[PDB]
Structures are given as structure tokens and as C-alpha cells.
Design a protein around this ligand. Structure first.
Ligand SMILES: [Br-]
Ligand SMILES: [Br-]
Ligand SMILES: [Br-]
Ligand SMILES: [Br-]
Ligand SMILES: [Br-]
Ligand SMILES: [Br-]
Ligand SMILES: [Br-]
Ligand SMILES: [Cl-]
Ligand SMILES: [Cl-]
Ligand SMILES: [Cl-]
Ligand SMILES: [Cl-]
Ligand SMILES: [Cl-]
Ligand SMILES: [Cl-]
Length: 837
């Protein structure tokens, strides 16, 4: 609500491969690749072997153009700014014969004063995008060594020279699409007197009784006179004013700094997912000049404390988050770009992914440093879903340059994004990079370079990650934690270091260690651990013809970038499952495997609180159709791992853990309230539905807030025979004093491959309407790890990848806007015994 007028330059753009004099319609925001696809000038880059066929684009320059009209009335506004929220990457901006800007950083928004260049009538904007490959060949040639960036899929590692999304050059789950273009919106704003260049709501203090805020405004006045104004900040909640403050000023030409204190008595705090409401106040700053509101800016603000506790202690060095005074065990995942082509990621897709996180009970997401600083919508959704955000700076897995020019470019992206993000309730901490010091010290790299260059890399590390970035956080976001790297010291190979900070476990997967190692190999905080899976068949069909379905085939090694890939999946599967003959059935067990194995680790982490205070698995999501460590595939389909993470992160969890022919049962709660007079009930049930022995009852159980506690141990010997352990399972239920159920769990006493699973039909009734299909499933005998498979991309399930227990009916709701009444939903139910003879 101000007097400015904004024109979106988001239609009527054209592009041209440089020097062909051929122009065609473009979509802006967008990418060169998508503009080509859309005129059938590229094949589907995700389909089959098209990866090799699309690389040529990275070697060309690309130009974009648009025309707009400006009226005499508009040209008579005091000020007119052209805003680029993003240019990828080396971009020459020309308006009406003027070079406005030589852009050189994908991660920076540019605000350009243009009134003096604009013309009544037609106006011509041209943007020239230099190939970031050809732009940096001479830079590389001058360097006289290749930076060891193995995820840059090219002999010459040119990524490290450019402030560009690292993953664009490739990665061990990624396609190489080194694209260009106007990747975020272009707006022209026509205004009077000034704009608000920045609005920071700085929390000075927070108690139950009062919140103290400093409203800090930078106002850019574009007229040459002194202008009396009143600054106003309105604090509102759900449309109702809570407090109003104002301040007389006389704005000077150029930058003005304005500071207004405001207080909220009896503040309603922002809570993370699980602990209550993620309450957001509306803070609105207005600049009023007489009758007219010349500038306004708002932020949604959450009133909370977040402290990162990173202190020497008996165990080494703690690493945990205290939210509103309470240690909060972190439960979430590492997030990567949702697409090879970032502007194709829509509002719906961002909303669905946060629905996926919130429904799996997560309270944290790490924006890993080989992606982007996410758009404003991402942080807004993290705010309104109660997800803490761990923000890496966009450096990952290689040393980077540290020359003055390079540092100046990084300082600019750090100041831009810190100011862009520092008003979000969700933002919890900054991290300098992903695994750069680990890589410098341990991946070797030392053996690859002269000592001279090595020493240059080591001092270069300090200049960027221990000086420039920490000092910048201290200046612009002084109450947020910064750490130079994840992991900061813990090395997976060095068990003595595990008590010290966050860990990236590479024992599971790279080191081939069994999932069971995660019960003994305990970190203070798991920032990264993971396991691959092939995605389900409807997702393979999207990139592969039926001809092409094989475990180490051509396209199934092309769709794996890790190279050890498909082999590790078979090696791990054989330990716990019978390997099926059919590709389809192997795909299904592979989803089950990744699910069970990772859930086991996620449970170990919560079980070992307080020693361990969080787990973020690698990885939530995918950028394209591919074999990856994801829990959600590129089309939004939940793998078994997503259902399993949800189960393992449930606020109260019954965790039966069997080691050394003994069972222990823990009760784990992340609730803020302590539960009293609880009963654990267990009974041993055979795969036919017959109870073995008596129900076991443990009464008088306290479940204190934010603890893991053991409530029952029993040696297996004398309780069940080896034959029994292959033939039955443990059913566990937790109930309050009044016998109402608050949690259940199922426990198997042997590896699935060692189970005597009876042959069985899962039968179902199906009630199908618009958008919806309600299945009632039944099997008189145990059906293990059932997978209700439909060919409908993106279908959501109330539940899936669960055991259907003997005799016990189970309701499952499947939903999709594409479910039409009368076209019966194709449904194929798989279970483990079905996969071998
Ligand atoms: Br201007
Ligand atoms: Br400006
Ligand atoms: Br000032
Ligand atoms: Br955006
Ligand atoms: Br060298
Ligand atoms: Br530091
Ligand atoms: Br055992
Ligand atoms: Cl504070
Ligand atoms: Cl005043
Ligand atoms: Cl040397
Ligand atoms: Cl609960
Ligand atoms: Cl176990
Ligand atoms: Cl329940």
C-alpha cells in the first residue's frame, strides 16, 4: 500500500543464439534450455541419453530482448528503478543504448536507476549472456592448475571461477545443464520521493512479558530537495493492530538510516513444527510525505529465540539448537534444487514439498551449499510451517579462489542474501560451505598439487570461510550462529573426532558399513548420512523405454553419478533381502531397503539424545529423474524412506532395538509435556495371526518431555526359539491411564531374507470418486512391506510401505486431481514374498 506503480517485464521477450539474427518467443523468468525445448530445438534433456545431446548450449552466447512503453505521466515520476532479482550469470544489460550493468553473480539482485535513460513511447532492453564456460576458459588457463571439483562434469573445472549454482555443472545425483537467463523476475518501479531499500526487524530481547524490536530502515531519496516525512511501523496480528510507532524526519538526498523502537507486551511466540503454532506478526513500515504513502515494505515476523549451543563438554563439543529456551532435537533433511531449470519450479511445487516435510514431522531443513540461496517463497513457507532453516553459503566440496576480485563478488552475494533472508523466523544459522575443509585435509587433494599451491588453497580457505563470511554475518546478522564448514571437525574415518560437532557419516554407503553401525557410531549431530534407491517404475518409465530396464544397464549407470553406485545397492540388499530376478521387483525391494536401513539410523539418533541432538538425512528431494539418496523423487512420489522418516520422527515413538540376542524398548518423546501413568503392552504374533505366549504389560511409565528412556529389556534366549524368531513379530502399543493409544510399533526378530513368510493374497475393496480412491486391504496372513503402486504420477497416500498384519484390516486413501470417477484406478500391490519362489 504505497503510491508506486510496478510494471512486471514478464511477457513479450525473445531470445537468439548470438549472431544468428534468428529471434523466437521466450519465457521470462526462465532458462535458455527451456526456451529451446519449447521450440523443439532441444530434446527432453531428462529422457534417456539426451544428456550428451544438450551440452552444446553451454558453449554458445544467448541474447534476450523485450520492448515496453513508458507514458509521459510515468516519465514524470520522481524516480524509476529497474530490478533484476536474478541473472545467470555473465550478463550485459542494455537499455536505450546505455550499458546499465555487467552482471557477474547469479545470487545477487541488482537495483538500477533508469529514469534518465527511459524514453516516452518505446523502450528497448537487450541482455547479452556470455557462456560461463567460454567466459572462464582464459581465467582457467591463467590459473595453471585445475581445482579438484569432481562434481563439475568436465575435464576443466570452471565452476569454481563463477558465482553460479554449483550443481548446474553436474553432481553425483545431478544432470549437467550449465544454463543462462533471467532466472528471477524483472520489475520496473515508478515512484515518488524514495524507496525503502531495506527493512530489518531486529529483535533486541524476548521474554514472556515483552518483545523489544528495533525497526531499521534504509530509505533512498532520489529527489534533490529535503523532504519532511513521517515514518510509521504498524505491528498487526491477523489484521488487528497490536502497536503503532512513528517518527518525524527530514529525508536528505541519497541514503537515510531510520531506527524506530517498538515493543510487543505478552508476545505470542513462533514455535517450531511439533511444539505449537508458527505465529507470524505483520510488520509494515510506511514513509508518509503529507497525505501520500510514498513507500511501504512489510515482513512477517516470528518472535522467538534460536540459540546454537556449540560448547566443550565431557563428550567433546555439543552442537544443538535451543528454541525459545528449550533444547530441540532436530529432525529433517538436506534440501537440493527442485529442478535442473530453477524457474520451472512453481508455487505449487514449493508448497507440496513443504507439505511433505511438515507431514513427515520435520522441524529442520538444511539448504545445502551446491544449490541456490532459495527464493523468498521457500523461506516464507518454512516460516508458516515451523521448519528451522540451516543456510549454507553456496560453496561445496572443492577449495575456491580467494583473490581480491573473487572475495569482492562473494561479499556482494553475502550482503545481498543475508539482508534478503534475515527477517525470516525460520532462519536458524549460516554455514560457510559443505565439506571444503574435510576435502582439503582428507579427500587428499594434497597429493594432487605442489606444496606451494596447497598452502595457497589453505590460506585461501581462511580468507573466505574464517574471515570474510564470519565478519559479514557478524555485521548484518549479529545474533545468528555461523560455522565455517559442515562438518566442522568430525571426520567419519576418525572415531575420536565424533564427539566434536556435527558429523557427515560416509561409513554407511561409501564405507559399505551395515545400517547396524549407526547404532554404535554416534555423532553429536548428524548433518549428513544417506542411502540410494532407484525411484519407482512410473518414474523410470519417464526417462527409460521398457527395453532399457537393467541393474547396471547403459541408462541405469547414466542415471547414477555416484559410479559405485548400482553395485552398493545389490551388496546391501543381499545382506537383508533375497535379491529378486525381475528389475521391477528389485526396484521395489530397493525402496523397502533404503526405507528400513535409514529409519534404523534416524531411530538410533533420537534414541541417543542427549549425546546426539539431531539428524538431517541426505537427501529430501531430486532435481530430475535419477537414482539418488532422495526420500521424494523428482515427480513428488514418496519413496518408502519418506513414509519411514515420518514414522521415525513421530513426536512419540516406541523404539524396540534388538542387539546381542537381547531386546530393549525405549520411549522417545519430543512433546513439551511429560506423560504419566502410561502402559507399554507387547505380544508375540505369528504370521497366521495366532498370539504366542502371554501379553507382556509394563505399567506405571513416566514419558518425560524431550527424552529417550529404556522401559524394558528381555534376553531372547528362553523367550523365543530361533524358529519362532523367523515365524512371528512383536506388536508394541503405548496407552495413557484411560487405555487410549498414543503410539504403536511392530518389531521383526530376524532379517527379512531369513523370515518364513507365508504365501498370501492381499485382497482389497476400492471406493473411487473425483480426486480420490479409498482402498480397504486384507490378508489373513502377514504381507511384508506392501507397496500399493499406481501408474498416476504424484498420487498421494495416507500410508504405504507398511506391513499388513495377519487378519488386520487397513484403510488407505489415495488422492490426485487426475482421479476421475469411472476410470477405475489401476492398482498393483507388491509384498516381499511375491518377489521370489
Ligand atoms: Br531514477
Ligand atoms: Br535506484
Ligand atoms: Br541518515
Ligand atoms: Br523468485
Ligand atoms: Br599444482
Ligand atoms: Br569462523
Ligand atoms: Br540380535
Ligand atoms: Cl533476542
Ligand atoms: Cl519523532
Ligand atoms: Cl612447491
Ligand atoms: Cl503425540
Ligand atoms: Cl532392532
Ligand atoms: Cl497410534
Amino acid at each position: 500500500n504505497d503510491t508506486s506503480e510496478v510494471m512486471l517485464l514478464d511477457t513479450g521477450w525473445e531470445f537468439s543464439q548470438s549472431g544468428t539474427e534468428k529471434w523466437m518467443p521466450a519465457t521470462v523468468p526462465g532458462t535458455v534450455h527451456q526456451d529451446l525445448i519449447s521450440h523443439e530445438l532441444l530434446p527432453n534433456p531428462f529422457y534417456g541419453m539426451n544428456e550428451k545431446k544438450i551440452q552444446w548450449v553451454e558453449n554458445e552466447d544467448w541474447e534476450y530482448r523485450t520492448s515496453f512503453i513508458v507514458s509521459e505521466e510515468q516519465l514524470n515520476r520522481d524516480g524509476i528503478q529497474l530490478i533484476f532479482e536474478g541473472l545467470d550469470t555473465y550478463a550485459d544489460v542494455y537499455l536505450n543504448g546505455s550499458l546499465l550493468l555487467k552482471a557477474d553473480n547469479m545470487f545477487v539482485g541488482y537495483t538500477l536507476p533508469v529514469k534518465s535513460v527511459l524514453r516516452k513511447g518505446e523502450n528497448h532492453l537487450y541482455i547479452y549472456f556470455h557462456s560461463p564456460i567460454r567466459q572462464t576458459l582464459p581465467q582457467y588457463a591463467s590459473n595453471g592448475f585445475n581445482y579438484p571439483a569432481d562434481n563439475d562434469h568436465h575435464e576443466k573445472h570452471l565452476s569454481v571461477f563463477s558465482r553460479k549454482a554449483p550443481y548446474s555443472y553436474g553432481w553425483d545425483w545431478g544432470i549437467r545443464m550449465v544454463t543462462s537467463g533471467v532466472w528471477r523476475p524483472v520489475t520496473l518501479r515508478f515512484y515518488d520521493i524514495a524507496t525503502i531499500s531495506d527493512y530489518y526487524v531486529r529483535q533486541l530481547s524476548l521474554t514472556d512479558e515483552n518483545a523489544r524490536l528495533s525497526n531499521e530502515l534504509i530509505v533512498n531519496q532520489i529527489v534533490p530537495q529535503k523532504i519532511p516525512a513521517e515514518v510509521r511501523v504498524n505491528v498487526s496480528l491477523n489484521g488487528t493492530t497490536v502497536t503503532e510507532v512513528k517518527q518525524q524526519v527530514t529525508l536528505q538526498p541519497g541514503i537515510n538510516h531510520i531506527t524506530l523502537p517498538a515493543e510487543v507486551t505478552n508476545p505470542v511466540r513462533w514455535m517450531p513444527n511439533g511444539w505449537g503454532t508458527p505465529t507470524l506478526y505483520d510488520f509494515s513500515a510506511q514513509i508518509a510525505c503529507g497525505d501520500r504513502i510514498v513507500a511501504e515494505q512489510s515482513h512477517r515476523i516470528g518472535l522467538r529465540t534460536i540459540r546454537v549451543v556449540n560448547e566443550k563438554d565431557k563428550d567433546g563439543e555439543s552442537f544443538y539448537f535451543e528454541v525459545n529456551g528449550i533444547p530441540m532435537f532436530a529432525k529433517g533433511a538436506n534440501y537440493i534444487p527442485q529442478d535442473a531449470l530453477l524457474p520451472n519450479v512453481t508455487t505449487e511445487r514449493y508448497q507440496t514439498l513443504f507439505r511433505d516435510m511438515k507431514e513427515a514431522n520435520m522441524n529442520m531443513v538444511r539448504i545445502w551449499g551446491g544449490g541456490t540461496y532459495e527464493n523468498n517463497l521457500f523461506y516464507d513457507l518454512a516460516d508458516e510451517n515451523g521448519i528451522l532453516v540451516w543456510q549454507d553459503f553456496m560453496f561445496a566440496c572443492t577449495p575456491y579462489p580467494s583473490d581480491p576480485t573473487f572475495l569482492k563478488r562473494v561479499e556482494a552475494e553475502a550482503v545481498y542474501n543475508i539482508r534478503r533472508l534475515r527477517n525470516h523466523a525460520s532462519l536458524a544459522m549460516w554455514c560457510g560451505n559443505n565439506e571444503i575443509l574435510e576435502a582439503l585435509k582428507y579427500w587428499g587433494f594434497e597429493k594432487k598439487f605442489t606444496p606451494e599451491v596447497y598452502q595457497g588453497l589453505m590460506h585461501g580457505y581462511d580468507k573466505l570461510f574464517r574471515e570474510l563470511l564470519p565478519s559479514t554475518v557478524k555485521e548484518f546478522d549479529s545474533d545468528r550462529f555461523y560455522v565455517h564448514s559442515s562438518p566442522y571437525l568430525a571426520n567419519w574415518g576418525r572415531p575420536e573426532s565424533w564427539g566434536t560437532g556435527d558429523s557427515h557419516n560416509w561409513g554407511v554407503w561409501y564405507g559399505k558399513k551395515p545400517f547396524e553401525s549407526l547404532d554404535t557410531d554416534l555423532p553429536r549431530f548428524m548433518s549428513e548420512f544417506g542411502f540410494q534407491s532407484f525411484p519407482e517404475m512410473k518414474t523410470i518409465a519417464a526417462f527409460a523405454a521398457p527395453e532399457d530396464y537393467q541393474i547396471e544397464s547403459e541408462v541405469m549407470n547414466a542415471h547414477q553419478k555416484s559410479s559405485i553406485g548400482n553395485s552398493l545397492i545389490r551388496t546391501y540388499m543381499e545382506r537383508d533381502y533375497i535379491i529378486p530376478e525381475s528389475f521391477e521387483d528389485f526396484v521395489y525391494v530397493g525402496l523397502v531397503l533404503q526405507g528400513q536401513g535409514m529409519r534404523h539410523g534416524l531411530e538410533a539418533h533420537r534414541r541417543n539424545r542427549p549425546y546426539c541432538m539431531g539428524t538431517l538425512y541426505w537427501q529430501l528431494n531430486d532435481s530430475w529423474p535419477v537414482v539418488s539418496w532422495s526420500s521424494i523423487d523428482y515427480y513428488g512420489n514418496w519413496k518408502a524412506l519418506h513414509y519411514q522418516a515420518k514414522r521415525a520422527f513421530a513426536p512419540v515413538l516406541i523404539n524396540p532395538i534388538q542387539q546381542n540376542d537381547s531386546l530393549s524398548v525405549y520411549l522417545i518423546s519430543d512433546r513439551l509435556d511429560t506423560m504419566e501413568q502410561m502402559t507399554l503392552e507387547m505380544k508375540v504374533v505369528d504370521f497366521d495371526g495366532k498370539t504366542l505366549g502371554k501379553k507382556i504389560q509394563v505399567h506405571s511409565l513416566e514419558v518425560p518431555a524431550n527424552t529417550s528412556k529404556c522401559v524394558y529389556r528381555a534376553k531372547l534366549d528362553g523367550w523365543l526359539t530361533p524358529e519362532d524368531c523367523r515365524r512371528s513379530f512383536l506388536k508394541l502399543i503405548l496407552k495413557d491411564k484411560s487405555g487410549h493409544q498414543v503410539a504403536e510399533s511392530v518389531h521383526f526378530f530376524r532379517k527379512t531374507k531369513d523370515l518364513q513368510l507365508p504365501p498370501t493374497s492381499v485382497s482389497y475393496q476400492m471406493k473411487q470418486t473425483d480426486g480420490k480412491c479409498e482402498l480397504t486391504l486384507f490378508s489373513s496372513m502377514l504381507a511384508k512391506d506392501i507397496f500399493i503402486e499406481t501408474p498416476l504420477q504424484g498420487a498421494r497416500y495416507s500410508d504405504n510401505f507398511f506391513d499388513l498384519l495377519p487378519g488386520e484390516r487397513k484403510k488407505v486413501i489415495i488422492t490426485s486431481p487426475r482421479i476421475k470417477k469411472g476410470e477405475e484406478l489401476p492398482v498393483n500391490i507388491k509384498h516381499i514374498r511375491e518377489t521370489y519362489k
